[PDB]
Enzyme design. Structure first.
Site, PDB file in Angstrom:
ATOM      1  N   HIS A  41       0.808  -1.222   0.000  1.00 56.23           N
ATOM      2  CA  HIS A  41       0.000   0.000   0.000  1.00 56.23           C
ATOM      3  C   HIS A  41       0.845   1.278   0.000  1.00 56.23           C
ATOM      4  O   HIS A  41       0.280   2.372  -0.160  1.00 56.23           O
ATOM      5  CB  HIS A  41      -1.030  -0.070   1.150  1.00 56.23           C
ATOM      6  CG  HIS A  41      -0.494   0.283   2.502  1.00 56.23           C
ATOM      7  ND1 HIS A  41      -0.684  -0.532   3.601  1.00 56.23           N
ATOM      8  CD2 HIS A  41       0.184   1.364   2.953  1.00 56.23           C
ATOM      9  CE1 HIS A  41      -0.113   0.015   4.661  1.00 56.23           C
ATOM     10  NE2 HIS A  41       0.421   1.166   4.296  1.00 56.23           N
ATOM     11  N   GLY A 143       2.344   6.149  10.076  1.00 57.93           N
ATOM     12  CA  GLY A 143       3.749   5.969   9.790  1.00 57.93           C
ATOM     13  C   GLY A 143       4.336   4.662  10.273  1.00 57.93           C
ATOM     14  O   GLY A 143       5.478   4.345   9.913  1.00 57.93           O
ATOM     15  N   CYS A 145       3.423   1.587   9.556  1.00 59.35           N
ATOM     16  CA  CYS A 145       3.366   0.460   8.635  1.00 59.35           C
ATOM     17  C   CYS A 145       4.761   0.002   8.252  1.00 59.35           C
ATOM     18  O   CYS A 145       5.698   0.797   8.191  1.00 59.35           O
ATOM     19  CB  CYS A 145       2.555   0.823   7.406  1.00 59.35           C
ATOM     20  SG  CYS A 145       0.825   0.894   7.904  1.00 59.35           S
TER      21      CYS A 145
HETATM   22  C1  LIG Z   1       0.576   2.674   7.940  1.00 57.31           C
HETATM   23  O1  LIG Z   1       1.510   3.598   8.500  1.00 57.31           O
HETATM   24  C2  LIG Z   1      -0.829   2.917   8.500  1.00 57.31           C
HETATM   25  C3  LIG Z   1      -0.953   2.508   9.976  1.00 57.31           C
HETATM   26  C4  LIG Z   1      -2.252   2.932  10.672  1.00 57.31           C
HETATM   27  C5  LIG Z   1      -2.509   4.421  10.815  1.00 57.31           C
HETATM   28  C6  LIG Z   1      -3.315   4.544  12.110  1.00 57.31           C
HETATM   29  N1  LIG Z   1      -2.908   3.360  12.865  1.00 57.31           N
HETATM   30  C7  LIG Z   1      -2.327   2.440  12.104  1.00 57.31           C
HETATM   31  O2  LIG Z   1      -1.891   1.342  12.466  1.00 57.31           O
HETATM   32  N2  LIG Z   1      -1.740   2.159   7.624  1.00 57.31           N
HETATM   33  C8  LIG Z   1      -2.816   2.711   7.047  1.00 57.31           C
HETATM   34  O3  LIG Z   1      -3.154   3.877   7.209  1.00 57.31           O
HETATM   35  C9  LIG Z   1      -3.641   1.822   6.124  1.00 57.31           C
HETATM   36  C10 LIG Z   1      -3.285   2.198   4.675  1.00 57.31           C
HETATM   37  C11 LIG Z   1      -4.572   1.850   3.913  1.00 57.31           C
HETATM   38  C12 LIG Z   1      -4.528   2.433   2.483  1.00 57.31           C
HETATM   39  C13 LIG Z   1      -5.246   1.435   1.595  1.00 57.31           C
HETATM   40  C14 LIG Z   1      -5.184   0.093   2.297  1.00 57.31           C
HETATM   41  C15 LIG Z   1      -4.610   0.318   3.687  1.00 57.31           C
HETATM   42  C16 LIG Z   1      -5.645   2.414   4.861  1.00 57.31           C
HETATM   43  N3  LIG Z   1      -5.085   2.075   6.188  1.00 57.31           N
HETATM   44  C17 LIG Z   1      -5.774   1.986   7.359  1.00 57.31           C
HETATM   45  O4  LIG Z   1      -5.309   1.500   8.373  1.00 57.31           O
HETATM   46  O5  LIG Z   1      -7.008   2.505   7.276  1.00 57.31           O
HETATM   47  C18 LIG Z   1      -7.762   2.534   8.518  1.00 57.31           C
HETATM   48  C19 LIG Z   1      -7.362   3.681   9.420  1.00 57.31           C
HETATM   49  C20 LIG Z   1      -6.686   4.796   8.919  1.00 57.31           C
HETATM   50  C21 LIG Z   1      -6.329   5.857   9.751  1.00 57.31           C
HETATM   51  C22 LIG Z   1      -6.657   5.811  11.097  1.00 57.31           C
HETATM   52  C23 LIG Z   1      -7.333   4.715  11.615  1.00 57.31           C
HETATM   53  C24 LIG Z   1      -7.681   3.654  10.780  1.00 57.31           C
END
Ligand SMILES: *[C@H](O)[C@H](C[C@@H]1CCNC1=O)NC(=O)[C@@H]1CC2(CCCC2)CN1C(=O)OCc1ccccc1
Ligand SMILES: *[C@H](O)[C@H](C[C@@H]1CCNC1=O)NC(=O)[C@@H]1CC2(CCCC2)CN1C(=O)OCc1ccccc1
Lengths: 306, 306
Positions: A41, A143, A145
């Site tokens: 992603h 951040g 991930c």
């Molecule tokens: C990677 O750094 C983040 C980690 C999240 C951010 C908040 N807590 C975490 O663990 N991953 C994502 O933001 C992830 C990317 C996404 C884009 C398309 C597929 C996956 C959407 N996504 C996600 O976790 O969405 C749910 C979310 C987003 C923000 C805050 C809470 C929940």
């Protein structure tokens, strides 16, 4: 004595963390030999994160679209491929700090340490379990991930988790290091939800043995139970079933304490039915299920790694 | 989101751990530059551990009585001295893995990570607090002496604890890295005991703010309290007094959540008086006091180290 939620020493993994930037997205990658592993992603844009087609998105990328930073030293990408939900960035420099390692896909109930990272820099380490519903109750912000979960066995790092996303209940979902999600989750922003969780029965029993090894005995009783009869009670308190296999893994701890496994099931039954009545076990007022039988033996015996 | 008992990444400290053997005693030492720091009770014999005279015992030692092993590489001792309750072994090789570091003597209530070690090899890492009674509730077995506790601030390891002994209640006592015990304890096998402990009030409040930051709000209320009136309740539940200083440190968290510090004291009062009535906060059925206000901000903000 004493009993703590103990993580593995994180040094071998710290030496592997790098920053991966693509477009306006920055996250962590795992640098082993000349390959950087990170969530696919990273190639997503803020526009198509609802139903992205990653093959389509990736064929549009060039190597130079990926900025990889290891400390203050830029790694050049010379190739990229996607395996399930992870991206593999081939770089021209092998990580000299690469430990001996394996990739393993763990079963629910198993524990691992998470090295939480931002911008390729470690923030902290903590111990997790893979829940029965294939989430983990982590501590993850924007951040994080590409932070990984892992176990160590003597000298070898077994990587078992890479963080991808947070579900609406605030729990976390991710993949093994070959990019296969744990559970039914997918890396798109759709209407997924964790699914009903259950308590990891064999781990609770392990932790009760930890308590006995450390001198908490107040919850023991003279009664016993059959495995069937125990599981009738477990079902009703949303505990997962105890198998003969679980009983067998609990063998060593049973042998060390002198408490038959089914005898400790009888204590767990009474604890489920009566609560703890103001008392604590190993500093907890809840029944703790994030220690495996292996975790208990390792901590109560003093096993090290090198 | 999520909130976990997070330890610092342990890699910088792992690179400093060594094995020190004297006579029939083996424990851990901390190798920084060309000095190995370890507990002076390493020179004790199983005969005079009741009232040892360490100056007398040390003047009888030669350098070659000390076997120092860093991995599978023997370090030669070229000098020794004793500073309070720690031994300083001068070796002929400076640790190339020496991080930037400081020695700090912490106040009760402050937290730190412990890298538990046996035979100079790390076993695990976990987070601790210095209790008000100057013990720590660790997880330590035979051989763990010389394991250290530490914090990290950007690139610098602040060492604050070295493990020396276990008290009869199963809690642990040790020194700062200059060998001064925390609390009234002494390194001889006499009739010492921990002394009455109390709950670290400012930390409980920090953790309640952590809960609010993460979406637990059920314990909030509309009432407020004065600092004096709060402390009257704290005293009776064996909480330590809250000072205006503590209130000030809780400023940032108050500002982030919009909950005045005294308002959160009012929630803590009701929690003390009514219990939690079957509910949990951040996965705990007890009020947790091993997170400082700094710990909460670091974890909820994502601060890293390098
Ligand atoms: C990677 O750094 C983040 C980690 C999240 C951010 C908040 N807590 C975490 O663990 N991953 C994502 O933001 C992830 C990317 C996404 C884009 C398309 C597929 C996956 C959407 N996504 C996600 O976790 O969405 C749910 C979310 C987003 C923000 C805050 C809470 C929940
Ligand atoms: C150093 O490896 C040990 C660590 C202990 C062992 C059990 N749990 C621990 O944390 N330190 C000692 O054994 C320490 C040495 C001693 C010799 C003279 C002064 C200090 C005695 N001592 C100690 O902790 O005694 C109490 C004790 C001993 C064994 C088991 C429980 C409690």
């Amino acid at each position: 004595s004493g009993f703590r939620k103990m993580a593995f020493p994180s040094g071998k993994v710290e030496g592997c963390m790098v920053q991966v930037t693509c477009g306006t997205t920055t996250l962590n990658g795992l640098w082993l030999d000349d390959v950087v592993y990170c969530p696919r992603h990273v190639i997503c844009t803020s526009e198509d994160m609802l139903n992205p087609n990653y093959e389509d998105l990736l064929i549009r990328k060039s190597n130079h679209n990926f900025l990889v930073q290891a400390g203050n030293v830029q790694l050049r990408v010379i190739g990229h491929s996607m395996q399930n939900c992870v991206l593999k960035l081939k770089v021209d420099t092998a990580n000299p700090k690469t430990p001996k390692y394996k990739f393993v896909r763990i079963q629910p109930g198993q524990t691992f340490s998470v090295l939480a990272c931002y911008n390729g820099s470690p923030s902290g380490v903590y111990q997790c379990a893979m829940r029965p519903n294939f989430t983990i109750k982590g501590s993850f912000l924007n951040g994080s991930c590409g932070s990984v979960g892992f176990n160590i066995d003597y000298d070898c790092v077994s990587f078992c988790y890479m963080h991808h996303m947070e579900l609406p209940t605030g729990v976390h979902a991710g993949t093994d290091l070959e990019g296969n999600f744990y559970g039914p989750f997918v890396d798109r922003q759709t209407a997924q939800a964790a699914g009903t969780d259950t308590t990891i029965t064999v781990n609770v029993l392990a932790w009760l043995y930890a308590a006995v090894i450390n001198g908490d005995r107040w919850f023991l009783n003279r009664f016993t139970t059959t495995l069937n009869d125990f599981n009738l009670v477990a079902m009703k308190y949303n505990y997962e079933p105890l198998t003969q296999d679980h009983v067998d893994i609990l063998g060593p701890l049973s042998a060390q304490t002198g408490i038959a496994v089914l005898d400790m099931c009888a204590s767990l039954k009474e604890l489920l039915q009566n609560g703890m009545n103001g008392r604590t076990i190993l500093g907890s007022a809840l029944l703790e299920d994030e220690f495996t039988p292996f975790d208990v033996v390792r901590q109560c015996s003093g096993v090290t790694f090198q």
